[PDB]
Amino acid sequence: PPVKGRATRQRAAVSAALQEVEEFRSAQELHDMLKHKGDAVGLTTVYRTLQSLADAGEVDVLRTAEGESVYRRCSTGDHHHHLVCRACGKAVEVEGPAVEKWAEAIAAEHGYVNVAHTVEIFGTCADCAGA
Template sequence: MKRNTWQREAVREALASNEGFVSAQSLHTGLREHGSTIGLATVYRALADLAAEGEADSLQSPEGEAIYRACSTTGHHHHLICRRCGLTVEIGADDVEQWAQRVASEHGFTDARHVVDVFGLCAKCSQASTAR
């Protein structure tokens, strides 16, 4: 476990204040707008550390950018993420877990790990799209 520095704590707090996933660049911009002198590389390192320790979720957006959010669930889990508003719902996915293990085993793989996140439009954003 890494030692807790003021920079790491600032990143942790900024991440917790965001509702959905956020990029390192966006988080850095927000910190700087609030007077922080933290550097972008430090934000990236802190986010990577928080993700490695299970304090933050990290995934790749549909555009290929790494995005993060404060993790509210410990252990392996998946997400439903709205592409428009960023609403995120943590979900269990027993069927996905069984499928991943079965497919890995069928191909002779052991110790299989996976990342599954589903991007779509939440009910509110879907309703707004059809109303236009």
């Protein structure tokens, strides 16, 4: 996980933690679990590094209904969209050219030069209903 800044142990640690975790996580709870591992990193430095990763793009970032920015890495680097369970957090990556073609058709119809598409579908998970 190369970073723009000079490599070191702490960014390697947070990158490894993101690698192991395959769920949407917020910065403060990420720091909580990171401290639980025992690295004892600083909150603002964690903020700096995760902002850098979000800028780099290898970690997808979503915004919750409360307004929180939640980050997680995707195995595949191609652009896609994530289906997430609010109760459990199971993030599954799917992509379809139909939505993209729809976006380009709308942009051309309205004469838009460039566009940015953001699509997240929220829904109720299958296993949580069962007890």
